[PDB]
Structure 1
Amino acid sequence: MSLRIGVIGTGAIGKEHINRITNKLSGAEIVAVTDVNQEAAQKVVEQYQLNATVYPNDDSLLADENVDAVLVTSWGPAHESSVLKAIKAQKYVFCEKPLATTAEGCMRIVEEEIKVGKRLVQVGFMRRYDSGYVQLKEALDNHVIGEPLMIHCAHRNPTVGDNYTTDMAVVDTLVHEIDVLHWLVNDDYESVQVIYPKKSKNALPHLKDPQIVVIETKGGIVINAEIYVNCKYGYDIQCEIVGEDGIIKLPEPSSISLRKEGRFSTDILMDWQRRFVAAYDVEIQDFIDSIQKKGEVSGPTAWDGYIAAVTTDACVKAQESGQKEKVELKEKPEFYQ
């Protein structure tokens, strides 16, 4: 059959996932939705022409015997509650970041999932499904460059809104690097340090931008991550991994080249939504296919959600202290190995 999916939270993110499941992907259907604003959920069912029940809350949606799996796409601080309820209802769950707002909240989810005996929770770190990152992972797993030693990366954005604050550089922005890098190199984070260059003219007075975040792993890999969210020129993700015997680097997004007016050039995307559309499609298709074929999910795990929560909190601490701060992680359970 089609995997029958319910959606908890019908804002921009939920709508985009509803659109991809309904109009782009294979093997699933939206059969149920809920939102805090019931009127909004009804509008969504109408706009996307869904054959779906509108439920007043997640408890009633999760009680629907004909819902197999849910997307948790509500307000971030509301995610944890729905994830816990879904685990208890024994539904598969795809949770947009964050899994929970604290390490403790992630640990509550971890404890309950481990009881189930199979993986129900996939966290929405879509970078792992981007073709460039998949290529990097394959090269590393094949020992192409020997042991990784250093990672140099950048997350650049053209401009941010007036409400974007210093902490969000790590909470909303660097969190993607935080998830993908430890996955690439199969190592755990140990410490973080934040350094502030000269503030850019393109940043509002309350915002510290750019920033450099230096992260060391337990194995001794050193990551230097630049975050510059008012770079003006484009939305740009760059990542180079220096190994003992060679160096691998993430590609530019594909663009025709142009020779014109004394310049040889390619395009730089301006819109972050154009950068990872394929990865979002693949991540959800993987959720669907893994469930149908394996009876459990296969992507970033609740434990990856925990690592992101602990590490982001340490980075925010380091933003304030100017000192090297410890990333204190519990031992990874065999369940998540």
Structure 2
Amino acid sequence: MSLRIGVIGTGAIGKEHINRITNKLSGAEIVAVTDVNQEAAQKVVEQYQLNATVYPNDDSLLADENVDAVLVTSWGPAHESSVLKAIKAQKYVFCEKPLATTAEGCMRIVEEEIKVGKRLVQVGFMRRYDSGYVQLKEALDNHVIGEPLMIHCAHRNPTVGDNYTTDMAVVDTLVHEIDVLHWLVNDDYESVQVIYPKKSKNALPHLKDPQIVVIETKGGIVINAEIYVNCKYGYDIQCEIVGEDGIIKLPEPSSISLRKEGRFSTDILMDWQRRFVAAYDVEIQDFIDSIQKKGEVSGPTAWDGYIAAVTTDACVKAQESGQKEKVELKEKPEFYQ
């Protein structure tokens, strides 16, 4: 009895999710796809020899009685809408970042779910399923290094397109950090300062690259997060956590050592795609399994997607300001703990 899923947005990342659910994972199938380009979606269907149905809009897809859950994997803007609809049609929703582009949009979604009595919304922040980040979580829950104090993390890309803009650095990129970091330390943020180092020769005129983002939490944990998307050497994600009595750090992605031409080296990835492939699979499978076994979702909540929208706003504010912007959060609803 496989979970029947409908995909809203046959994008490039929606093409991935369709393929893994189809050819890698267990206990689910894609039966409905809807795309703004109805000829683009119609190609994705013959591609993976799917046995699905193409809809012009989400309404018609959500109206289908086959679909039990939906993958909201289209443009960032077109999320908040598709989501609220799904909650009302009472389907399960896996929503890829962002939950909603506006901190208030995520607030509407919260209220809706709080009504439906249970949890339908899971946000696609995959890092939480990555074994690296999991080991960190494990170590922290065990008090291995006592109380966390500071966190040094980086997030680097070989290069970007002419479409990448200063705000995208804290919106499409630093977003995962913002998500997983607070999950790990179990703390809410508070302030976000932004500091622009000497600009890189690799970055385009309209872009501010690199950037540094300091972030304090209510507890007093200080996080400086480097964001450099034109580093050139590769795609690299670093995270070190200094504690009271010890330090734990995120591993490098497994590689074979090589001794040649006077150097002892490992390999650095070049494609953000390769870095977290395993995390997606574990992610979706948890979505499926959680629905079939518990009648609800389990991953990153809709509240977290809102914590994302707030924080990711104070950051874009400090990008122009240059001052210690504030992060203000509505109290956590009982519904979520």
TM-score clears 0.5:
yes
- Write the distance in 1 (CA, Å) between the matches of 2:224 and 2:10: 37
Q: Secondary structure at the match of 2:159?
A: coil
- Structure 1 Cα separation of the partners of residues 278 and 318 of structure 2: 34
Structure 2 SS opposite 1:93: strand
Pairwise CA distance, 1:162: 1.3
Q: In the TM superposition, what is the alpha-carbon distance from 1:13 to its structure 2 partner? A: 1.3
Normalising by structure 2, we get a TM-score of: 0.99
CA distance in 2, matches of 1:161, 1:53: 34
Cα distance in 2 between the residues matched to 1:214 and 1:234? 24
SS at match of 1:238: strand
- TM-score normalised to structure 1 length: 0.99
Instruction: Output the CA distance in 2 between the equivalents of 1:34 and 1:260.
Output: 51
Task: Give CA deviations for 1:239-263 in whole Å, capped at 9, x if unaligned.
Answer: 0000101000000000010111111
CA deviation after TM superposition for structure 1 residue 64, in Å: 1.2
- The Cα offsets for residues 112-144 of structure 1, whole Å up to 9 and x where unpaired, read as 000011110000101111110000000001111
**Separation in 1 of the partners of 2:54 and 2:268?**
41
TM-fit CA distance, 1:43? 1.1
SS at match of 1:161: coil
Distance 1:298 1:331 in 2: 21
Per-residue CA deviations over 1:269-319 (Å, capped at 9, x if unaligned) read 011100000001111111001001111000001001000100111100001
Between the aligned partners of 2:45 and 2:129, the Cα distance in structure 1 is 28
2:44 & 2:267 partners in 1: Cα distance? 35
Structure 1: which 5+ residue stretches go unaligned?
none
Query: Within 2, Cα distance between the matches of 1:79 and 1:163?
Result: 20
Shift of 1:63: 1.1
SS at match of 2:242: strand
How far 1:60 moved relative to its partner? 1.1
Instruction: Give the aligned CA root-mean-square deviation in angstroms.
Output: 0.7
What's the CA shift string for 1:44-100, capped at 9, x where partnerless?
A: 111111010112211111111121100001111010001000000111000011111
Off by >4 Å, runs of 4+ in structure 1: none
Q: In structure 2, list runs of 5 or more residues that go unmatched.
A: none
* CA distance, structure 2, for counterparts of residue 79 and residue 13 of structure 1: 14
Using the alignment, how far apart are the partners of 2:143 and 2:222 within structure 1? 18
1:38 CA displacement: 1.2
Once the two structures are superposed, what CA deviation does each residue of 1:147-173 show, in whole Å capped at 9, x if it has no partner? Answer: 110000000111111121111110011
Q: CA deviation at 1:333?
A: 1.0
Aligned-pair identity in percent equals 100
Secondary structure, aligned partner of 2:20: helix
Distance in 2, matches of 1:209 and 1:42, equals 39
In terms of mean alpha carbon deviation, does 136-145 or 56-65 score higher? 56-65
Compute the displacement of 1:11 (Å).
1.4
Distance 2:156 2:11 in 1: 25
Taking the aligned partners of 1:298 and 1:140, their CA distance within structure 2 comes to 21
Distance 1:56 1:97 in 2: 23
Number of the residue aligned with 1:12 = 12
